Design a protein around this ligand. Structure first.
Ligand SMILES: CCCc1nc(C)c2c(=O)nc(-c3cc(S(=O)(=O)N4CCN(CC)CC4)ccc3OCC)[nH]n12
Ligand SMILES: [Mg+2]
Ligand SMILES: [Zn+2]
Length: 323
């Protein structure tokens, strides 16, 4: 409708309000936003992806995100997808990626939490759940999001990559597995370290653009691009960030309550009777989100400064909410 088109004017912008597109699209923010991104970037025409097939697939994907999970639902997938879309347009990475690398990064963004049960890897491992027995305790959820994501391409009327060559499906697949497995938080300190090495030897050509020799370097930036996108919540406007914070904290406290009914040890932050939301956001930003984004800002100097300033204002806001 009208309100939806006005809200979509900010598609290429960090300030887009995905909460508002969710309301104007009959709660189909992922289908909605992915259709917009794919059209704007001409991915449908480029890869001969039928509009019909694409909607069918995105709708089914969207239905695999549980709407009863407070944070990890299709709204979150849509926010990560749209943030990734904005990140691929950083001036510093202009014309560096192939359309296939762009296709892969946004496709990964969309599936990266599909069928999330609302609990963490450590909870699934500690409760001997079926998926942890299946995946041998390694990146249990991430491996599953990928399995579910790719399993839905196995029906002609849903195969969005049908018209790619065999070579492009093989490459796109490698890239997506690699990007989604990189959203596993237990790999954060390893990724951030390799990204700080990427920055130290970073090269920028005469045109103000980064030089990525070959595939190893390009996929490194892409793994990090989607990792930051997945942790982009405290870098948005204080109004969006407070809503995201209330969601994630609802999920975490829900997990602590499950942990409590079983007699398991409750992690100091999922413990609703004690945990200070405010203090845990400030520790989240200081020890994890700011180091990641400060490093991303260095790689893309100066395109991510506005994002760093917002981060430091949101942290400062949250810090002022504790006596
Ligand atoms: C206090 C909530 C902090 C918070 N706010 C936001 C917006 C987010 C967010 O997007 N993602 C993360 C987030 C943070 C961690 S963690 O490293 O901080 N950590 C969680 C707590 N446990 C058990 C005690 C140890 C590991 C793990 C997973 C997370 O979700 C990302 C998929 N946390 N987060
Ligand atoms: Mg995840
Ligand atoms: Zn996520």
């Amino acid at each position: 409708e009208d309100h939806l088109a006005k809200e979509l004017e900010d598609l290429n912008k960090w300030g887009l309000n995905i909460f508002n597109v969710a309301g104007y699209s009959h709660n189909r923010p992922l289908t909605c936003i992915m259709y917009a991104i794919f059209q704007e970037r001409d991915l449908l025409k480029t890869f001969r992806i039928s509009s019909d097939t694409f909607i069918t697939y995105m709708m089914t994907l969207e239905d695999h995100y549980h709407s009863d999970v407070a944070y990890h639902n299709s709204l979150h997938a849509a926010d990560v997808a749209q943030s990734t879309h904005v990140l691929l347009s950083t001036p510093a990475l202009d014309a560096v990626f192939t359309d296939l690398e762009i296709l892969a990064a946004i496709f990964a963004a969309a599936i990266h939490d599909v069928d999330h049960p609302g609990v963490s890897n450590q909870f699934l491992i500690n409760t001997n759940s079926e998926l942890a027995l299946m995946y041998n305790d390694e990146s249990v959820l991430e491996n599953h999001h990928l399995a579910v994501g790719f399993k839905l391409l196995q029906e002609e009327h849903c195969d969005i990559f049908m018209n790619l060559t065999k070579k492009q499906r093989q490459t796109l697949r490698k890239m997506v597995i690699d990007m989604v497995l990189a959203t596993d938080m237990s790999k954060h300190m390893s990724l951030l370290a390799d990204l700080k090495t990427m920055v130290e030897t970073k090269k920028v050509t005469s045109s103000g653009v980064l030089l990525l020799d070959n595939y190893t370097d390009r996929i490194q930036v892409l793994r990090n691009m989607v990792h930051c996108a997945d942790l982009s919540n405290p870098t948005k406007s204080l109004e969006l960030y407070r809503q995201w914070t209330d969601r994630i904290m609802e999920e975490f406290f829900q997990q602590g309550d499950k942990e409590r009914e079983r007699g398991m040890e409750i992690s100091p932050m999922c413990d609703k009777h004690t945990a200070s939301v405010e203090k845990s956001q400030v520790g989240f930003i200081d020890y994890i989100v700011h180091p990641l984004w400060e490093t991303w800002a260095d790689l893309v100097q100066p395109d991510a400064q506005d994002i760093l300033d917002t981060l430091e204002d949101n942290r400062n806001w949250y810090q002022s909410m504790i006596p």
